[PDB]
Amino acid sequence: FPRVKNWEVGSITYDTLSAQAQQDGPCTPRRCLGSLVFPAPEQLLSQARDFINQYYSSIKRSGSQAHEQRLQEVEAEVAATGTYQLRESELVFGAKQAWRNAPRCVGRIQWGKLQVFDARDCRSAQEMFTYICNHIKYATNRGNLRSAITVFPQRCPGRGDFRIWNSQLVRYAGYRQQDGSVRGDPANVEITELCIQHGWTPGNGRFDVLPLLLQAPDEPPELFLLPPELVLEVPLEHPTLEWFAALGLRWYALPAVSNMLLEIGGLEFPAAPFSGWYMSTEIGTRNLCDPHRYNILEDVAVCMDLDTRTTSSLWKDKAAVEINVAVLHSYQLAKVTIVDHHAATASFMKHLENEQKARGGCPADWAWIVPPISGSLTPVFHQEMVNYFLSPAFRYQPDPW
Amino acid sequence: KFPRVKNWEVGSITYDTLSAQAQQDGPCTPRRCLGSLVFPAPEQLLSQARDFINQYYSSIKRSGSQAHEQRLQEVEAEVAATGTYQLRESELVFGAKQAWRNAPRCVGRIQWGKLQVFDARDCRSAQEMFTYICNHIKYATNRGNLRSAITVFPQRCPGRGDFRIWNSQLVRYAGYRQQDGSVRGDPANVEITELCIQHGWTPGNGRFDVLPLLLQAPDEPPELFLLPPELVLEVPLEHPTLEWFAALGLRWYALPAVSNMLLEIGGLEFPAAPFSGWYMSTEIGTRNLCDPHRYNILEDVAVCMDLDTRTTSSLWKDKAAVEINVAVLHSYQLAKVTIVDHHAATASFMKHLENEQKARGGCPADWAWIVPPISGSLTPVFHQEMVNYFLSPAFRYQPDPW
Ligand code: HEM
Ligand code: HEM
Ligand SMILES: Cc1cc(N)nc2cc(-c3ccc(OC(C)C)c(CN)c3)ccc12
Ligand SMILES: Cc1cc(N)nc2cc(-c3ccc(OC(C)C)c(CN)c3)ccc12
Ligand SMILES: Cc1cc(N)nc2cc(-c3ccc(OC(C)C)c(CN)c3)ccc12
Ligand SMILES: C[C@H](O)[C@H](O)[C@H]1CNc2nc(N)[nH]c(=O)c2N1
């Protein structure tokens, strides 16, 4: 039982929940790979028995009652048909628990408040597209953002999968030219290539909202242009640097990830887009300052009249800080839910303590919980953490080409 | 089947084949990662001795030599007669450099080849020990143009106690606990400050009182030694535009000289081998000055900057922290004391990684420690995957002697 210390307060705790991790991670006694970004159907049933067993413990009702009853229904269902279906409340419970188990997610204090949209009755691309549009609309809620997941039909043995091709529902275009240089977001250059290749008309410049590429079983994907009024955007302005607005920067309101596989009780949902709200360093630091994303840091520094000649003026640090001030300020002015990295990390500490009392620990990936700016100014920096895999879980999955 | 490490900023891929040589075992298992933990006979003394000799003779492109095989037989014959063996002077110089080269949390390893190695294996008393240390400090400081050095005191041997330096660094500021339950000076050094006083040191009452050295000879109580004031170079901290900053009375010392780690070379152990380089400015500005459990000046800085303390979303902590680091860099450059900022440091560490991959097929690096504690993703090391493992020779932590 790993002894875990907080070096700011001197507290000690023991992670007993780690003793129930299963699906092996990438590390060995010889070497740690914790910094890596990507590390006979009989086993379907054993994964079902354990998932159901914590469901009934979670509602006290383990032993007696329909706890016993529900074990046979799945026993018999897999025996006849190979797969099984989850009850609606189980699917709600599995969604929340996989969020609760995401080691790299700093917003998990919120894991109990999740709206689950059951789309297992789906059978078309246009049927997915309307389901996605209800998600975005409900989740955006005019800027008072609400966590949401939409779950599409579970993969069946034989016959294909539902699968969104965009990494997120809202992503900006990436265009090349002669120079190999990119106009727009370089992270989304390939998916933009696959959008033109499927009959999309390209666009003006930096911030062209990509059309969705949705793929029902077998028959290939089809474009679906997003309606401009439901893709909510925030134009970036700075509270005191008057010239910042004229840089024409924007970002969208809703981070909505659409390329991960949800696993509950042994079933795989390759299309199950979830969404919440942004922590501001994701926008200001990673999306806009990363050298391989929009890469704006130098431009903001020239406007601030900073000494770009020598690294020891910390012009990069001054300019990054003001970009984040502009992100927070613009989202608030537009009344869109956003959280700063200090508030978010302070809440995650609170979640660590709750999770101690409840389950005896919490899988947490230190490199991803610590913010990408001002790391040691946040309480999670000085907090040792244990990373391991629990189920239910969100998992990465190969892209479909 | 060697780990594939990717650089995400540019798209590089290499495989760490050096990790397959990791002749120790860390705290991670397939079932859980413990990478963020701060703290993770003759037959085997022989196998480590043989491995180090093999290394040394490969580095002088003399592997498999008669001189190589002779040296193996000599060490095997010496652990037979005495249970231990002695390093040659050149093997000791090589081994200290390798230990620096192999330290996974050190971002300054680009410099690993330029290390001045003082052999103090003939040291006999705490008094001589003080003399070797003073000369280490004088050489390393070099009037502000700082040089990398290590002094090696006698190895651990059976039938005699260890040379130990009780202080964690050669230069540290006292920390006096108060009636408020508070601490004047550096809170991290409250323990050593009590130890010094209970071994007969007259305390001060400032926030930057340099602590005496507690120096333990074999089988002796620790002996207290006060450093000549003119040996400890100090940098008063001022800000290039914020003039009230100078009136905080902040200072820091020039020379980071770690003195409580164990140096291990081919199975031999050197529990007293203090080493020193130069500071990266974030160690001073972000950690030593802004950590809540250290000097904790951040709120006081931000209040004076007229920032909005009542809410986190003003990013008052980030802004105050960046100006404290500006003050550190400017103060050290004003005083002509060597210093490196985290952008220069991480850029050169990337060159180190490239140099190391060509030479040994990899490099042990601890991502959570290589990434600076501010502005992480503004540096190239943030986007570089790394593999953490333990190669030997090596610096290791060891328990406090008390
Ligand atoms: C409501 C506020 C939320 C915030 C502030 C938040 C924040 C974050 C952040 C900052 C990351 C790091 C990714 C990166 O920086 O590249 C992350 C990853 C992640 N988040 Fe959250 N998130 C929120 C809601 C949710 C919801 C509703 C879910 C699932 C239903 C979720 C699941 C995940 C997953 C699965 C990952 C990556 C998984 C992993 O690698 O462990 N988050 N989140
Ligand atoms: C010349 C300039 C040097 C710089 C800029 C530098 C930088 C650093 C930094 C920033 C740390 C971590 C501090 C922290 O985490 O708060 C570190 C750790 C360390 N450094 Fe260096 N260092 C230098 C020289 C040296 C030398 C000369 C040696 C030994 C001969 C050395 C050996 C180590 C070791 C053993 C650690 C701890 C590593 C571990 O625990 O795995 N460094 N260094
Ligand atoms: C619900 C949610 C809210 C939020 N506020 N943020 C989120 C960030 C990610 C996420 C996951 C992986 C990932 O990276 C993969 C390429 C490994 C990235 C960007 N790197 C973001 C996923 C979900 C998020
Ligand atoms: C030669 C040198 C130069 C420098 N510029 N910096 C250095 C920092 C450390 C060091 C080592 C460990 C450590 O922490 C514990 C694991 C003991 C800390 C503070 N976190 C600093 C050690 C040596 C350093
Ligand atoms: C998770 C983490 C990352 C990092 N990058 N650094 C860290 C440094 C410390 C830490 C805390 C106290 C401490 O020292 C006590 C003996 C006062 C030392 C060593 N001096 C290190 C603890 C955790 C750290
Ligand atoms: C190499 C390194 O592991 C990689 O760049 C990681 C580091 N930590 C991260 N943390 C978050 N939240 N998001 C990221 O994309 C990354 N990138």
Ligand SMILES: [Cl-]
């Ligand atoms: Cl994003």
Ligand SMILES: [Cl-]
């Ligand atoms: Cl220090």
Ligand SMILES: [Gd]
């Ligand atoms: Gd101007």
Ligand SMILES: [Gd]
């Ligand atoms: Gd001024």
Ligand SMILES: [Zn+2]
């Ligand atoms: Zn690990």
